[PDB]
Tab-separated table of C-alpha atoms in Angstrom:
chain	number	residue	atom	x	y	z
A	1	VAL	CA	0.000	0.000	0.000
A	2	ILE	CA	1.905	3.008	-1.369
A	3	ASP	CA	0.585	6.376	-2.484
A	4	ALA	CA	1.822	9.746	-3.728
A	5	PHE	CA	0.323	13.189	-3.201
A	6	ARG	CA	0.747	16.879	-3.924
A	7	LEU	CA	-0.976	19.975	-2.536
A	8	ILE	CA	-3.322	22.315	-4.395
A	9	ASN	CA	-3.856	26.036	-3.770
A	10	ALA	CA	-7.345	27.098	-2.685
A	11	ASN	CA	-6.973	30.144	-4.966
A	12	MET	CA	-8.061	28.039	-7.937
A	13	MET	CA	-11.437	27.165	-6.408
A	14	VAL	CA	-11.948	30.807	-5.415
A	15	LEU	CA	-11.921	31.469	-9.154
A	16	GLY	CA	-14.189	28.418	-9.377
A	17	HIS	CA	-11.680	26.508	-11.501
A	18	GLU	CA	-10.439	22.991	-10.838
A	19	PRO	CA	-6.820	21.825	-11.039
A	20	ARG	CA	-5.404	19.203	-13.382
A	21	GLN	CA	-6.808	20.085	-16.776
A	22	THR	CA	-7.351	16.748	-18.424
A	23	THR	CA	-6.726	15.306	-21.871
A	24	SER	CA	-6.606	11.545	-21.386
A	25	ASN	CA	-8.395	8.578	-19.871
A	26	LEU	CA	-5.335	7.122	-18.177
A	27	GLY	CA	-5.630	9.119	-14.947
A	28	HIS	CA	-9.039	7.787	-13.897
A	29	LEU	CA	-8.289	4.056	-13.763
A	30	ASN	CA	-8.543	3.826	-9.958
A	31	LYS	CA	-10.836	4.951	-7.161
A	32	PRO	CA	-9.871	6.248	-3.710
A	33	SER	CA	-10.953	4.413	-0.594
A	34	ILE	CA	-13.714	5.826	1.591
A	35	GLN	CA	-11.250	6.136	4.474
A	36	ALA	CA	-8.875	8.203	2.351
A	37	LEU	CA	-11.776	10.363	1.182
A	38	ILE	CA	-13.130	11.199	4.644
A	39	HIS	CA	-9.864	13.034	5.188
A	40	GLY	CA	-9.130	16.003	2.969
A	41	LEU	CA	-8.139	14.409	-0.340
A	42	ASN	CA	-9.573	16.230	-3.357
A	43	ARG	CA	-10.536	19.324	-1.360
A	44	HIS	CA	-6.860	19.846	-0.444
A	45	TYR	CA	-4.485	17.621	-2.453
A	46	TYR	CA	-4.396	15.193	-5.357
A	47	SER	CA	-2.782	11.822	-6.046
A	48	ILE	CA	-0.363	10.671	-8.754
A	49	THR	CA	-0.080	7.199	-10.277
A	50	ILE	CA	3.074	5.144	-9.755
A	51	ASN	CA	4.883	2.346	-11.565
A	52	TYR	CA	8.007	0.286	-11.012
A	53	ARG	CA	11.216	0.690	-13.005
A	54	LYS	CA	12.913	-2.655	-13.624
A	55	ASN	CA	15.731	-4.289	-15.543
A	56	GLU	CA	16.343	-7.920	-16.403
A	57	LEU	CA	19.712	-8.296	-14.646
A	58	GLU	CA	18.493	-7.730	-11.095
A	59	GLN	CA	15.498	-9.988	-11.713
A	60	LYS	CA	17.830	-12.647	-13.124
A	61	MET	CA	19.818	-12.578	-9.901
A	62	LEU	CA	17.001	-12.039	-7.368
A	63	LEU	CA	15.040	-15.192	-8.246
A	64	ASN	CA	17.926	-17.153	-6.688
A	65	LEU	CA	16.077	-16.643	-3.387
A	66	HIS	CA	15.484	-20.089	-1.845
A	67	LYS	CA	17.562	-21.924	-4.401
A	68	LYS	CA	19.561	-24.639	-2.669
A	69	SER	CA	22.727	-26.706	-2.846
A	70	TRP	CA	22.839	-29.447	-5.468
A	71	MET	CA	23.880	-32.045	-2.892
A	72	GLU	CA	20.592	-31.584	-1.045
A	73	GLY	CA	18.865	-33.183	-4.024
A	74	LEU	CA	20.635	-36.513	-3.439
A	75	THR	CA	19.897	-37.564	0.157
A	76	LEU	CA	18.152	-40.775	1.179
A	77	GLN	CA	16.090	-39.647	4.221
A	78	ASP	CA	17.243	-42.023	6.993
A	79	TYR	CA	15.690	-45.378	6.014
A	80	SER	CA	14.943	-46.154	9.669
A	81	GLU	CA	12.430	-43.370	10.385
A	82	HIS	CA	10.774	-43.652	6.963
A	83	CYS	CA	9.050	-46.952	7.737
A	84	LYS	CA	8.014	-45.624	11.138
A	85	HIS	CA	6.307	-42.651	9.504
A	86	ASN	CA	4.608	-44.867	6.926
A	87	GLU	CA	3.117	-47.329	9.349
A	88	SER	CA	2.153	-44.562	11.660
A	89	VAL	CA	-0.001	-42.951	8.957
A	90	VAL	CA	-1.578	-46.301	8.074
A	91	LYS	CA	-3.030	-46.545	11.596
A	92	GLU	CA	-5.138	-43.410	11.353
A	93	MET	CA	-6.170	-44.587	7.893
A	94	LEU	CA	-7.522	-47.665	9.704
A	95	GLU	CA	-9.434	-45.705	12.322
A	96	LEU	CA	-10.856	-43.365	9.681
A	97	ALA	CA	-11.943	-46.120	7.285
A	98	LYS	CA	-13.967	-47.667	10.101
A	99	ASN	CA	-15.712	-44.284	10.498
A	100	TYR	CA	-16.382	-43.621	6.801
A	101	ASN	CA	-19.325	-45.960	6.208
A	102	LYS	CA	-21.488	-44.364	8.926
A	103	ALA	CA	-21.368	-41.078	7.025
A	104	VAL	CA	-22.019	-43.035	3.848
A	105	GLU	CA	-25.149	-44.639	5.322
A	106	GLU	CA	-26.515	-41.321	6.622
A	107	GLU	CA	-26.165	-39.892	3.099
A	108	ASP	CA	-29.859	-39.182	2.551
A	109	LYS	CA	-31.985	-39.809	5.665
A	110	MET	CA	-32.203	-36.078	6.498
A	111	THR	CA	-32.930	-32.774	4.809
A	112	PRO	CA	-29.949	-31.758	2.632
A	113	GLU	CA	-30.449	-28.089	3.529
A	114	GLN	CA	-29.095	-28.761	7.022
A	115	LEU	CA	-26.440	-31.125	5.660
A	116	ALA	CA	-23.931	-28.273	5.582
A	117	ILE	CA	-24.526	-27.876	9.308
A	118	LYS	CA	-23.812	-31.603	9.685
A	119	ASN	CA	-20.224	-30.771	8.741
A	120	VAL	CA	-19.675	-27.701	10.888
A	121	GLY	CA	-19.350	-29.299	14.310
A	122	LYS	CA	-17.646	-32.549	13.398
A	123	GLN	CA	-14.814	-33.504	11.054
A	124	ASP	CA	-15.853	-35.595	8.060
A	125	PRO	CA	-13.990	-38.785	7.130
A	126	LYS	CA	-14.011	-38.331	3.347
A	127	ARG	CA	-12.118	-35.057	2.952
A	128	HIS	CA	-9.885	-35.784	5.928
A	129	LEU	CA	-8.894	-39.186	4.508
A	130	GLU	CA	-7.408	-38.426	1.096
A	131	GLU	CA	-4.675	-36.066	2.312
A	132	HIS	CA	-3.049	-39.135	3.859
A	133	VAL	CA	-3.045	-40.842	0.461
A	134	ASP	CA	-1.454	-37.717	-0.984
A	135	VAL	CA	1.299	-37.773	1.651
A	136	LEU	CA	2.020	-41.491	1.318
A	137	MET	CA	2.294	-41.468	-2.456
A	138	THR	CA	4.343	-38.271	-2.678
A	139	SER	CA	6.875	-39.622	-0.189
A	140	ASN	CA	7.152	-43.214	-1.398
A	141	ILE	CA	7.660	-42.278	-5.056
A	142	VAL	CA	10.649	-39.987	-4.615
A	143	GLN	CA	12.211	-42.152	-1.896
A	144	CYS	CA	12.321	-44.972	-4.442
A	145	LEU	CA	13.536	-42.958	-7.441
A	146	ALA	CA	16.479	-41.431	-5.564
A	147	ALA	CA	17.833	-44.847	-4.572
A	148	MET	CA	17.945	-45.948	-8.211
A	149	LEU	CA	19.722	-42.800	-9.351
A	150	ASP	CA	22.291	-43.287	-6.588
A	151	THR	CA	22.774	-46.984	-7.376
A	152	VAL	CA	23.630	-46.007	-10.958
A	153	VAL	CA	25.574	-42.745	-10.738
A	154	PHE	CA	28.187	-43.935	-8.179
A	155	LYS	CA	30.192	-46.969	-9.329
B	1	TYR	CA	2.470	-89.785	-27.547
B	2	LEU	CA	4.823	-87.205	-29.046
B	3	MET	CA	3.417	-84.222	-27.154
B	4	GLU	CA	5.069	-85.415	-23.927
B	5	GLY	CA	8.120	-87.500	-23.088
B	6	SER	CA	6.539	-90.857	-23.917
B	7	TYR	CA	8.900	-92.046	-26.658
B	8	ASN	CA	9.228	-95.827	-26.303
B	9	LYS	CA	5.673	-96.194	-27.576
B	10	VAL	CA	6.570	-93.933	-30.511
B	11	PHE	CA	9.375	-96.225	-31.650
B	12	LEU	CA	7.214	-99.290	-31.019
B	13	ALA	CA	4.487	-97.838	-33.243
B	14	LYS	CA	7.004	-96.841	-35.930
B	15	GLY	CA	7.055	-100.543	-36.797
B	16	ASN	CA	3.236	-100.714	-36.785
B	17	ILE	CA	1.494	-99.043	-39.732
B	18	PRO	CA	-1.616	-100.787	-41.120
B	19	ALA	CA	-1.609	-98.523	-44.194
B	20	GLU	CA	1.810	-98.958	-45.833
B	21	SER	CA	5.519	-98.537	-45.113
B	22	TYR	CA	5.343	-94.778	-44.412
B	23	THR	CA	9.129	-94.823	-44.075
B	24	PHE	CA	9.157	-91.474	-45.875
B	25	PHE	CA	7.809	-89.551	-42.879
B	26	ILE	CA	8.619	-91.800	-39.927
B	27	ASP	CA	12.245	-91.416	-41.032
B	28	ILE	CA	12.193	-87.617	-40.656
B	29	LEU	CA	10.418	-88.312	-37.368
B	30	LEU	CA	13.271	-90.529	-36.185
B	31	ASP	CA	15.812	-87.844	-37.044
B	32	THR	CA	13.853	-85.064	-35.337
B	33	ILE	CA	13.527	-87.285	-32.265
B	34	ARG	CA	17.234	-88.131	-32.140
B	35	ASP	CA	18.309	-84.495	-32.220
B	36	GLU	CA	15.676	-83.462	-29.674
B	37	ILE	CA	16.711	-86.149	-27.191
B	38	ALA	CA	20.349	-85.183	-27.695
B	39	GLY	CA	19.383	-81.626	-26.804
B	40	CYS	CA	17.322	-82.628	-23.780
B	41	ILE	CA	19.903	-84.940	-22.192
B	42	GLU	CA	22.311	-81.982	-21.991
B	43	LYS	CA	20.721	-80.852	-18.713
B	44	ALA	CA	18.776	-83.781	-17.282
B	45	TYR	CA	21.665	-85.196	-15.243
B	46	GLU	CA	25.339	-84.862	-14.344
B	47	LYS	CA	26.753	-88.150	-15.604
B	48	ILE	CA	25.993	-91.084	-17.882
B	49	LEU	CA	27.716	-94.364	-18.686
B	50	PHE	CA	28.798	-94.867	-22.276
B	51	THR	CA	26.929	-98.150	-22.722
B	52	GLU	CA	23.855	-96.669	-21.047
B	53	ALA	CA	24.027	-93.568	-23.240
B	54	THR	CA	24.384	-95.714	-26.351
B	55	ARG	CA	21.359	-97.797	-25.379
B	56	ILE	CA	18.951	-95.092	-24.162
B	57	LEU	CA	19.355	-93.548	-27.578
B	58	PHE	CA	18.040	-96.191	-29.902
B	59	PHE	CA	21.134	-96.537	-32.087
B	60	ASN	CA	23.323	-99.537	-31.311
B	61	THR	CA	27.097	-99.394	-30.877
B	62	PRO	CA	28.243	-98.212	-34.334
B	63	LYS	CA	30.695	-95.418	-34.951
B	64	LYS	CA	27.440	-93.428	-35.035
B	65	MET	CA	27.567	-92.855	-31.281
B	66	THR	CA	31.135	-91.597	-31.547
B	67	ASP	CA	30.144	-89.311	-34.419
B	68	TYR	CA	27.129	-87.971	-32.533
B	69	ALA	CA	29.331	-87.128	-29.559
B	70	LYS	CA	31.817	-85.494	-31.935
B	71	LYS	CA	29.039	-83.412	-33.493
B	72	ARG	CA	28.286	-82.083	-30.009
B	73	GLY	CA	30.714	-81.955	-27.108
B	74	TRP	CA	30.133	-84.975	-24.876
B	75	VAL	CA	33.770	-85.260	-23.833
B	76	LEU	CA	34.365	-88.744	-22.492
B	77	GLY	CA	36.182	-89.898	-19.386
B	78	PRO	CA	36.943	-93.321	-17.959
B	79	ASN	CA	33.536	-94.712	-18.924
B	80	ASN	CA	32.374	-91.249	-17.879
B	81	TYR	CA	30.475	-88.357	-19.442
B	82	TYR	CA	31.132	-84.895	-18.043
B	83	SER	CA	28.169	-82.626	-17.369
B	84	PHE	CA	28.173	-79.219	-19.000
B	85	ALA	CA	27.578	-76.947	-16.013
B	86	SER	CA	27.026	-73.192	-15.869
B	87	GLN	CA	23.493	-72.100	-14.838
B	88	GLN	CA	24.575	-69.078	-12.778
B	89	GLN	CA	25.361	-66.266	-15.217
B	90	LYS	CA	22.025	-64.408	-15.010
B	91	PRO	CA	21.775	-63.806	-11.233
B	92	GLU	CA	23.200	-60.969	-9.108
B	93	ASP	CA	22.256	-58.194	-11.527
B	94	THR	CA	20.590	-54.877	-10.744
B	95	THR	CA	21.801	-52.261	-13.262
B	96	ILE	CA	19.248	-53.194	-15.935
B	97	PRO	CA	16.649	-53.356	-13.148
B	98	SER	CA	18.113	-50.104	-11.846
B	99	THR	CA	17.269	-48.497	-15.206
B	100	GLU	CA	13.901	-50.014	-16.039
B	101	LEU	CA	12.665	-49.439	-12.480
B	102	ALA	CA	13.535	-45.776	-12.977
B	103	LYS	CA	11.577	-45.768	-16.228
B	104	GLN	CA	8.628	-47.457	-14.509
B	105	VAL	CA	8.496	-45.043	-11.566
B	106	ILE	CA	8.715	-42.070	-13.914
B	107	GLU	CA	5.800	-43.602	-15.804
B	108	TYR	CA	3.810	-43.888	-12.566
B	109	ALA	CA	4.303	-40.228	-11.752
B	110	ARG	CA	3.617	-39.141	-15.344
B	111	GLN	CA	-0.149	-39.730	-15.413
B	112	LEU	CA	-0.746	-38.925	-11.754
B	113	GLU	CA	-0.964	-35.134	-11.443
B	114	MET	CA	-1.313	-33.915	-15.035
B	115	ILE	CA	-4.870	-33.618	-16.309
B	116	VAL	CA	-5.752	-36.533	-18.577
């Protein structure tokens, strides 16, 4: 939120004129906020549009933000905790799957208008389930690819 | 009889044709049985006796046995036939698996997030 302003002399409105004689559409492309307009604004000062001067070089070197070391790409994630994480997640998948079919059976026995309210107080199994599938697949794919690349690129 | 290993009955029937001689085709059959048995014995067992080898194959004791061994390997010993033994070259390999597994996993991820 940046803005630019300049004063105007009350003389001009004593003549009954208005400042900023106008020849082009390009000044009117934005509207002031109500909060800015409660304060003086047009009855005392006027705003000017702004834009950002850029060049390619600084962009080309700024996007390096959060780039990382090549070696980081080839690490195998401690094969002993990996299986612990996996068959921790599977447990809550168990306890959720046993709670899914209740919400499948109640699919239609009540007015759908209040069905939204049926969500609000109590987490639903369906949406809350599939993020675990997302996690499991995303992890177990890359963990397996990296091992192959290693077992080829070194000796 | 020919579809499986039963071959004694085949040779017994080769002398039993109610139609005519049929030597023209049963000959070819005898040849294509000789070569097949020679190929199959190469891996059935470790050692054979020379008399036993000569008799299991239906030829007698002519120079034909010697020539058949010459045509193949069948190096003799003191009334001994050495087994050709290898059967261990294929195992303990991962590099070709280590490439086609990479291809397969890339294929899994291909059609997983892109809209199809």
